Amino acid sequence: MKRLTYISKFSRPLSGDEIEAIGRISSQKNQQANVTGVLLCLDGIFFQILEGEAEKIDRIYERILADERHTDILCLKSEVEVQERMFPDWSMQTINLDENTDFLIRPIKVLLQTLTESHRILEKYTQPSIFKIISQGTNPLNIRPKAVEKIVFFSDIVSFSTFAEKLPVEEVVSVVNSYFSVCTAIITRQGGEVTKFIGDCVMAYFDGDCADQAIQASLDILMELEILRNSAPEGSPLRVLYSGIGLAKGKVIEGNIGSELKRDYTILGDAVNVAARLEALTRQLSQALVFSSEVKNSATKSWNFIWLTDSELKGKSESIDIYSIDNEMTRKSSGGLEIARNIGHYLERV
């Protein structure tokens, strides 16, 4: 069996009437599916626990997920090896704690609410990989480190120091956050994971066999930034926001890395260094996207690869052959590196 626990926020106000109706109808379909559980509500927050066959639960939650009456849906716990149910008598019991006024339920009310709003704060500071792991039914703290092949992605803002010199601090942060939101959205939809931000740089990774997705994500980021630049208001700093991107492939260690009190679930490896160093060369090479021979050969799609150079760095005392893709978008983005060499004037008249 599978028991699932999630929380969510009302998309819009709901009345006790509407709440019960959701419950009453939940209880119905749940009876029909031998799934049981409890649904609570407290000041515009839903808490629900469901249990039943993995097959069934997954489909219910697929509908619950697509329901527009709540949002910010977060699975706190997925137990995918349950052999006994916790709420056998309740197909779907509803407990509206707002309406409740009981002696002991009152202090617990103020507790749940404080606990929930604190959890919601921590969520905003938490790697996306962690919640994914949790929803796969795994406690991320118990994952042991492993060697794995990854494609590593590194990208940063071209001439970022000029932004930081010229703009008000609120503007600088707005620009970086816009950049990060664009990269993160595209990378995530393409099956990758954004694992760290450092300065104005994004570090991300894809499964080792997913070079075509790494490359497509990268091209989509360039395309999206192009839309963002040419759609931005007159005088906006966004009109001169350009990216450089570097991709590398290698065996890295994945796992919980950090101090006692603070860890990240992330990767450690030479491919990370190589990706970052490739990305640094975007300027010298006048190419907005640059990647290693290994990424190129590992890709299966018929991209228009162009060989750029043979270069060195580090370490293994070896020269690495460096590629890009030749198309209208990469040419426009690569011309963008030139444009971004002199944006100080533009930026200081905002």
Added chain:
Amino acid sequence: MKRLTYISKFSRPLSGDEIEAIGRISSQKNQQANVTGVLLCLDGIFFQILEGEAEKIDRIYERILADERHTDILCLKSEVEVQERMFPDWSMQTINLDENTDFLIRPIKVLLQTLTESHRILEKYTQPSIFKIISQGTNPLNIRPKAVEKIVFFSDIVSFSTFAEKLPVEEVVSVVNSYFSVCTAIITRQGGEVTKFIGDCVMAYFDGDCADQAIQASLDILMELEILRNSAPEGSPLRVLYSGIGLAKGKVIEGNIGSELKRDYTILGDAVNVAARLEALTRQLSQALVFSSEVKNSATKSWNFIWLTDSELKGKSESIDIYSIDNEMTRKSSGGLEIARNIGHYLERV
């Protein structure tokens, strides 16, 4: 008034008897101080809410903090402008939910527990700065970005690539985590903040007027690693664990930086780049600790500064004068960079 909410874990088993005794005696002192609230317990977890004068509350919580019967104490919320109390009739009401068996309290029990263990997971993945901010009575998500002077700290493991090449993945992660735990402990006690790990590198910062603390932290890290090396088992990879450290000083932006769904509270600025580039030069300069002219002059203590070189990088088209400190510990640590050039043999026979 000030209302405080925290959670904590039993250090060791406590009985309902012991729990009530804590309550009964809490209620007493709380009556004597016009402070009110509620204390709940549920499967080895304490939840407490206290309210009263900031003066009083802070001292109670100072004792609660120093009490060995619970641990992992975490303030979820501090409201430092309260004008009305939530539990006027209760100097300290105790609600043992373990003992409770009420109809509605049961599903709420399983909820609190799930919510709490999920929060505890997120805590391990959360920057230390966030909890500090929360305990200062501030929602970190509402902090606006600001320009501030900081001393930036950057450090990494010397010849880390050799560790990763030669050791089992569990060993590699153990070594990095030991390193990170040493740096984090010392930096935090010296008033600094560890804000990011990237690869085997630590990035941290101190208030702009705290150069002497940045420098002392750095020297303490070197000393601690020396203890760690010479105390390590025979054949241990820890025996050849050495660090390089770079410090820079500058105006940076502090604030919430990231994508929509994932941000860090951290800093953005040229001083970050300079610190990282100084640290990279530790190898070339054969000095384990290197810092900028600005850090040197900003320090007030009578350190034994040694001038090292005049070097360049980036950007502002300027040469920066680079310093270290000459004493037995930095000499031993700097010889350590040489030792660490050839640890492949040692490491592969573990």
